[PDB]
Write a protein that binds this ligand. Structure first.
Ligand SMILES: OC[C@H]1O[C@@H](O[C@@H]2[C@H](O)[C@@H](O)[C@H](O[C@@H]3[C@H](O)[C@@H](O)[C@H](O)O[C@@H]3CO)O[C@@H]2CO)[C@H](O)[C@@H](O)[C@H]1O
Ligand SMILES: [Ca+2]
Length: 145
């Protein structure tokens, strides 16, 4: 299926056109080493800081009218709080909350059945880290159902 998110797996090694807000210093795009850390390809978003941190990773997409689903893949230190949110599509915001549970214990947050009526959507991932927390984010998808 066509994936409507741009640079959805960070495989350029760069964020663009994703935007980072909040504690930008906690988050980078890396060539995964070991490569296990990425869900697909060679690159992933990696976050870490030695003090508590809060950031958002987001991308806006203009879409043909239709019904969509979005998700991504993450793993990280046991206890990191991550949220996936969708907004601005015509209905109220929807979110999913996940906890990472340890290295390579992959989680796949997903929101389905999003009827896009405004011709656009905003995809936002929120990360709330404790001091020393870390994790990886990769392999976004935005598909028309
Ligand atoms: O569990 C033993 C193994 O740990 C691996 O390290 C894991 C990740 O590969 C690594 O990225 C992560 O490191 C954190 C963060 O991602 C990184 O940016 C930052 O610099 O350090 C953070 C840790 O303080 O740590 C986990 C730990 O399980 C090793 O890759 C592997 O060789 C092996 O030691
Ligand atoms: Ca990737």
């Amino acid at each position: 299926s066509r994936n409507y998110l741009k640079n959805p797996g960070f495989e350029t090694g760069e964020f663009s056109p994703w935007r980072v807000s909040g504690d930008k210093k906690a988050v980078k795009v890396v060539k995964a080493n070991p490569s296990s850390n990425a869900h697909q390809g060679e690159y992933a978003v990696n976050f870490w800081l030695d003090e508590s941190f809060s950031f958002e990773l987001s991308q806006e997409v203009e879409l043909p009218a239709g019904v969509y689903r979005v998700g991504f893949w993450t793993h990280g230190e046991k206890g990191v709080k991550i949220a996936l949110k969708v907004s601005d599509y015509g209905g109220n915001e929807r979110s999913v909350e996940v906890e990472t549970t340890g290295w390579l214990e992959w989680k796949n947050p997903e929101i389905r059945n999003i009827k896009v009526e405004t011709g656009r959507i905003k995809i936002t991932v929120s990360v709330e880290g404790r001091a020393g927390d870390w994790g990886f984010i990769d392999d976004f998808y935005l598909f028309r159902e």
